[PDB]
Amino acid sequence: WMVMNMTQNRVFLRAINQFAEVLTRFFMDQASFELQLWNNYFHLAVAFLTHESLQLETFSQAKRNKIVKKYGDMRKEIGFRIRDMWYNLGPHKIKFIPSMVGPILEVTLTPEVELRKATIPIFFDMMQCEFNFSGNGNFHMFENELITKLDQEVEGGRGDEQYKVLLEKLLLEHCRKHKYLSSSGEVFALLVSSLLENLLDYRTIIMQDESKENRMSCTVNVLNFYKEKKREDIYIRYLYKLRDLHRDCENYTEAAYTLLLHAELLQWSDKPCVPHLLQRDSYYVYTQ
Amino acid sequence: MPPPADIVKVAIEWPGAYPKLMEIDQKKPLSAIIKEVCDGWSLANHEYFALQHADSSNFYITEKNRNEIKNGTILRLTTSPAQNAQQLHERIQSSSMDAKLEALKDLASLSRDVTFAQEFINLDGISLLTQMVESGTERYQKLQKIMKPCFGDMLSFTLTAFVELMDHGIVSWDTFSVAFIKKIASFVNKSAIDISILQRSLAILESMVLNSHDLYQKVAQEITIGQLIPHLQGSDQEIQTYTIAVINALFLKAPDERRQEMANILAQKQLRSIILTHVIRAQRAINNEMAHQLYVLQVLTFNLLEDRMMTKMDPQDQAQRDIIFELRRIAFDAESEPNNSSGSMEKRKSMYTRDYKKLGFINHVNPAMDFTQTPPGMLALDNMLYFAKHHQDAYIRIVLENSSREDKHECPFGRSSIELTKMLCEILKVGELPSETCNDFHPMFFTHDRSFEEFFCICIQLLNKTWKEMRATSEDFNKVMQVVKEQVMRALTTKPSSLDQFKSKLQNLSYTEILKIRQSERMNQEDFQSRPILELKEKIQPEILELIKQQRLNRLVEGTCFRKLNARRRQDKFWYCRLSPNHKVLHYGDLEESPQGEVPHDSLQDKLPVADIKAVVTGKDCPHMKEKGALKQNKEVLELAFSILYDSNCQLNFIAPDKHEYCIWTDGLNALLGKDMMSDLTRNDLDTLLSMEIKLRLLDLENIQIPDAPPPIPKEPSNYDFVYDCN
Amino acid sequence: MARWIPTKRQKYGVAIYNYNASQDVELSLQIGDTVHILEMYEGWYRGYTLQNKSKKGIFPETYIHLKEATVEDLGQHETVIPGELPLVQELTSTLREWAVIWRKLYVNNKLTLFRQLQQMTYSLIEWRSQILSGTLPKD
């Protein structure tokens, strides 16, 4: 009952729209209390947004024609509502960061272009807000998990290259819209795009015949990016994958090299404060 | 700049002498051409020579038809027409019988020209012929019993000459005498004449009928219905056509009362029955002239109905009141008591209004107002008379049915009958002159002398049944008219044989099954071979074969259990040859017994260069089957032979289970070389794929004829000016 | 190619056979090549072919069967019987889907289901040809 599904989604869109309108009607800056509900609000919005997409209907063009004839695309206005709500919300983006980093990724890597084109400036807005918050130091603590979630998204099978080109064009435009921080923003975004094409090559070659050299170059590039950004979680998991693949190809010298990399990026502190270095396959004491 | 055409080549032949070449210009007058010919050939007496065409026409050169002259055409010189006429006249009274025979034959053969006929008649030829015919009555009697065949042939030629002269109309109408009519009558009276003589006599009779009307009365004075029926007994179709045409001529310019009288004579002799048992049951080459005979006899029946239906039935006729009273008595003896027959007219008016308020009649004071419009007029009255006479059970059922209509959709019988009569008159083209080219014939008109009434009865019964099934309303009059027109056209196109069989076939016909089967047969024939249809499918074959080869490669990728050679002494017989997902290398070798199928792993021989494979030999050319020691293969596996030849010294010979997968494997091997398929399975799939695709694409042309000739290319403006913006 | 006028009485652009390659945009057109034409000319029609709706194709008037019928066949009284030609157009959509159905049914061998699908589609096209013209009672 796909017609039932789409009517249900249409009424869900109506309900979300009226929720947004009542929130704008009585939950402005004066209602600065209990602002945590917006986290679940946007989580629900993104979960609703992440289905019935282009690839769902891509099996036959007739389905796309009929859906745009009777209802039209809904994810577009979903993104429009999300972006206008983010614009009109306020300067309280600091508390959103650790929660908003994940969900915005799915709309970030959308197969379409126009909605992503209109949605891109939210990244510039959040970057400038993050600088305003973190001028008393650095602001890597967004790009770290941004890269983490981008890697997860590409591992889910949603990477693209002309989208990378569009991203680079838009971020160059936004850096030209900005000041000396444009240099740091653009170099970090260049790192992001290089890592994205890295994972694009990884995914487009993991399905083709095995070659075992381009994947190695891509993985060592991700390791370089992670050690450049002072991030080890994705770095340690990817060197684990490297070690597994090298066990598959009985190459002990590179395995020893990667083990030395892990050892040198592992401190002598004996208290497992950060549990990311452990393995989630089993559950025991796991003392370091 | 076209080259000049003033120079032409033409050879003028002679009887017994070879031709001579000269250039002839048709623009100049014939006198100048003759003078130039005489000057060139040094021939005197230019007025004693002429020109003629040596083609099949064998005609002389005429001012109106001289364009038939073409270069490289045989032309022979002949004697001048004046000399030919003079010698024919001299040999008319010659002493040689053979000379007379050949002269008359030549004159009859060469009597197809009008101007030369005028020239011949200018010499009092008609008067001489009339005098020799009048004086020759007793002259040929002595030698009639000796040379009847030749005399009859010459008489037939003379009759043909007279017929063509009459067709040209050169002979005056007043010049005709009663002597010719008497001679024709005497020829008819003879019982020892041939069929050809009879055909010529009947043609003369019909021509004379076409000439005037009093001569038609004179010939009808010697016409009996009992002599033209033996003519039908002859199985020849041409004599039947001639006799029927003369019969129609009897109905052309005769009084309508005499038309009815002779129609009654035909009915009492039951001519249509013997016609059915003679010409209808004949399965010979039916003539288009016979089709014209059928059409004109149909028109004659229509006129014999019209001359009695064209008149208006006076509503003031008390005899008409009594007739309709008896008709409604014998029709409505369920609601009307039998006692009103001897009753008064007040009960008559009460019955009128009570039985016409349920039959869709507005006026109840003057019920005969609807009888002043013809067609049909009184024809519906005769139809209801016949219904009461023969269909009394159905008549009573209809009477009790129409009055019982509780759907408020009672059909007015009079209006429906008038509409159906108008539609029949329109479709049958009543009131128009006979066509000179159309030859449509309906063999159902000869089943009965009243065949039109029977056809109308069948039509109205079918319409009543169809309306009862549909239970139609007042909003589909156009639908009713179109459906009845289409069903009548479909019934007439079937050429029925008998009324009962025709009525049965009316219901037996499916819902346009004939059209669908004809379309399917035409499509199949076009797919087999056609100029404007067959090229369409073979023009576009880039994707079907590519996807077929892709499917074969996928079959190679999935793979199955293969077989080895000479597995007799502790040797495995099941293994796998799996194609790589890159479709470049083959994984194969000696494997174990795996009932499940292929085991995904690296086999013994993991490499098979496909870029160096020469070909795959199929049949008895396999080197492994040519063993002369102990590894000889069975004769029953000859259809399972295929070897991938490579390195010119080693062979990889595989064994197939049966024929279909052997063909699949050879198709895959040939697709690897980018060649055609060699599988019975593929050809089975090849035909249905193209057929299914064409079946899918023919939807747009449904209900539309597809022209065969390429459509023309109308001119287009040179400029690309867009009044309406693109995109 | 001038004097092109917007029109909506040509949504059913009927081809004849493989059109000549005199025009570069034009190829060997198939039988069921409906052109959604948006421009009008006396003897030529250029519009979007169904195979490539983003590519224009100029088709002569003699190559186009005049079809004033639109998608809605009741506004212009095109229906032989009201409320039936929507069925024929949804059946055309169903067959355009059958296209990709058979295009995909060969990648994976579904021989029993494929054969029964063939029989069903054969009956379907038989019934479509039978009801190409509506001349039967409503039942």
Numbering used by the authors:
A (entry chain B): 1006 to 1293
B (entry chain A): 1 to 727
C (entry chain B): 1 to 139
Paper text:
The human DOCK5 and ELMO1 complex, along with an upstream signalling factor, a constitutively active mutant of RhoGQ61L tagged with polyhistidine at the C-terminus, and a substrate, nucleotide-free mutant Rac1G15A also tagged with a poly His-tag at its C-terminus, were reacted on a grid coated with a lipid membrane [67PC/21PA/6PIP3/6DOGS-NTA Ni (mol%)], followed by cryo-EM data collection. Reflecting binding to the lipid membrane, we observed approximately all particles of the DOCK5•ELMO1 complex, appearing S-shaped with an extended longitudinal axis, in a uniform orientation. The ~7 Å resolution map, particularly in the regions corresponding to the armadillo repeat motif (ARM) and DHR-2 domains of DOCK5, exhibited sufficient quality to trace the Cα chains. We then modelled the entire complex molecule using the reported structures. ELMO1NTD, which interacted with DHR-2 via the Ras-binding domain (RBD) in its auto-inhibited closed form (right), diverged from DHR-2 and expanded along the lipid membrane surface due to the binding of RhoG to the RBD (left). This large conformational change brought DHR-2 into close proximity to the lipid membrane and allowed it to bind to the membrane-anchored Rac1. ELMO1CTD, which is tightly bound to the SH3 and helical region of DOCK5, also rotated along with DOCK5 such that the variable loop connecting strands β1 and β2 (VL1) on the ELMO1 PH domain was oriented toward the lipid membrane. The basic residues in the C-terminal region of Rac1, which interact with these acidic lipids, play important roles in downstream signal transduction. In the extended-open form revealed in the current study, Rac1 on DHR-2 and the PH domain are in close proximity to the lipid membrane. In conclusion, the extended-open form, one of the conformations of the DOCK5•ELMO1 complex on lipid membranes determined in the current study, revealed that a major conformational change accompanied by interactions with acidic lipids is required for efficient GEF activity of the DOCK5•ELMO1 complex on lipid membranes.
The DOCK protein family activates Rho small GTPases through guanine nucleotide exchange factor (GEF) activity. Herein, we present a new conformation in which DOCK5, ELMO1, RhoG, and Rac1 are aligned on a plane and symmetrically flattened, as revealed by cryo-EM using a lipid membrane-coated grid. Biochemical and cellular experiments indicate that conformational changes driven by acidic lipids are important for regulating the GEF activity of the DOCK5•ELMO1 complex on the plasma membrane and are essential for its downstream signalling.
